[PDB]
């Protein structure tokens, strides 16, 4: 199976546009910080998040990522792998190529992918397509630097669903 292109790809996708690909040495590689399997075609879903958010990739979790970006069902039957990538995704001055969704009208259903860039409405006046008072652009960019702490450093996450 083409796992090399899944795990060793040069560029990873943002969590709001998380990538999906259709499909013992991985377990014994010992290069992964998180390897958790629930319940035991294959789907490999790849994205990049913060370290403190890795706890949100699990069935029955709440937060920004779990509710607005990536949701896992209660009866999940796959595995989650996550490893640190500070030496690749961080650069001096800041790497701002990764985005995530902050506001949404409703929670995401399991395995839902929202890429809309419509301006979120918080008040009553319509946004009319321009940012302003009580109207926010939904997607915000991460900031990764080589000096940040472990929880603020980038992490690459791959979810395998059978």
């Amino acid at each position: 199976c083409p796992f090399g292109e899944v795990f060793n790809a040069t560029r990873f996708a943002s969590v709001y546009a998380w990538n999906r690909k259709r499909i013992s040495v991985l377990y014994n590689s010992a290069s992964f910080s998180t390897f958790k399997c629930y319940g035991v075609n294959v789907y490999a879903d790849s994205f990049v998040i913060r370290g403190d958010e890795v706890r949100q990739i699990a069935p029955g979790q709440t937060g920004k990522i779990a509710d607005y970006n990536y949701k896992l069902p209660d009866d999940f039957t796959g595995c989650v792998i996550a490893w640190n990538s500070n030496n690749l995704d961080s650069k001096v001055g800041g790497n701002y190529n990764y985005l995530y969704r902050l506001f949404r009208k409703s929670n995401l259903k399991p395995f839902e992918r929202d890429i809309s860039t419509e301006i979120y409405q918080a008040g009553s006046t319509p946004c009319n397509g321009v940012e302003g008072f009580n109207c926010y652009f939904p997607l915000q960019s991460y900031g990764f630097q080589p000096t940040n702490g472990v929880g603020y450093q980038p992490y690459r996450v791959v979810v395998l669903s059978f």
Partner: antibody, heavy 120, light 107 residues
Framework: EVQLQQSGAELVKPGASVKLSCTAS????????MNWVRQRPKQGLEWIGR????????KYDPKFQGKATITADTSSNIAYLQLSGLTSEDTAVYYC???????????????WGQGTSVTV | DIKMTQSPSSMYASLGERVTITCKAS??????LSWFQQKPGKSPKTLIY???RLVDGVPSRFSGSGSGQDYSLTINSLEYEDMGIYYC?????????FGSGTKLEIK
């Protein structure tokens, strides 16, 4: 709302060329695929090809190889289809569509265009 | 190229009658099939994807089933707004292939 706007009708003499445009609003085309479909008068639907604007890779139906070329500009959020060597059998309405189940996702909706009439 | 077959080409049905359309492929496609409906003069719209999943907003009277090489679409209570041409598409292996189409009319 998500909209896909296509160019107007074009009259093409035989053997000439024409470039069609599909402008996308409401989303960034870099995050999805864009498909091209053709429907001849009183005929069925045929798939031409697709492009991934993130890297520019394209796929084609091999009977349309050498006749159509797909290009996308991420800065302007416009997808292009170039037709060359047109004959009288290429008179049809051309569609640009955005399916999301071709990326094998769940709880998705399709978005189509209005269609451009090309007469030869 | 995965040749795609549809049947019947045209049929008539009264209001409230149930209608089934057959969609058969030349080889296994792992249930990657989609259904389209096109009203006169309008652009096509996707009704069912993955052969049993409904697009949000579609009436619940629509249903789809099938596996392997045989797939089908069923309408329970046919109404006026169900006339048109119906297509089924495969997207498992390139190139994508449509069907010949089925025209539905009301007596």
């Amino acid at each position: 709302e998500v909209q896909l706007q296509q160019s107007g009708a074009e009259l093409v003499k035989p053997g000439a060329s024409v470039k069609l445009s599909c402008t996308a609003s409401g989303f960034n085309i870099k995050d999805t695929y864009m498909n091209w479909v053709r429907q001849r008068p009183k005929q069925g639907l045929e798939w031409i090809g697709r492009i991934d604007p993130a890297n520019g890779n394209t796929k084609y139906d091999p009977k349309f190889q050498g006749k159509a070329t797909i290009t996308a500009d991420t800065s302007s959020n416009i997808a292009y289809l170039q037709l060359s060597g047109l004959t009288s059998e290429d008179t049809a309405v051309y569609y640009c569509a955005r399916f999301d189940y071709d990326g094998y996702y769940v709880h998705v909706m399709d978005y189509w265009g209005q269609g451009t009439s090309v007469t030869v | 190229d995965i040749k795609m077959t549809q049947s019947p080409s045209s049929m008539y049905a009264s209001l409230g009658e149930r209608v089934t359309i057959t969609c058969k492929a030349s080889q296994d496609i792992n249930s990657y099939l989609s259904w389209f409906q096109q009203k006169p003069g309008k652009s096509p719209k996707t009704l069912i994807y993955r052969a049993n999943r409904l697009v949000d907003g579609v009436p619940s009277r629509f249903s789809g089933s099938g596996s392997g090489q045989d797939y089908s679409l069923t309408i329970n209570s046919l109404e006026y707004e169900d006339m048109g041409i119906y297509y089924c598409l495969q997207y498992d292996e390139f190139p994508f292939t449509f069907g010949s189409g089925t025209k539905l009319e009301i007596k």
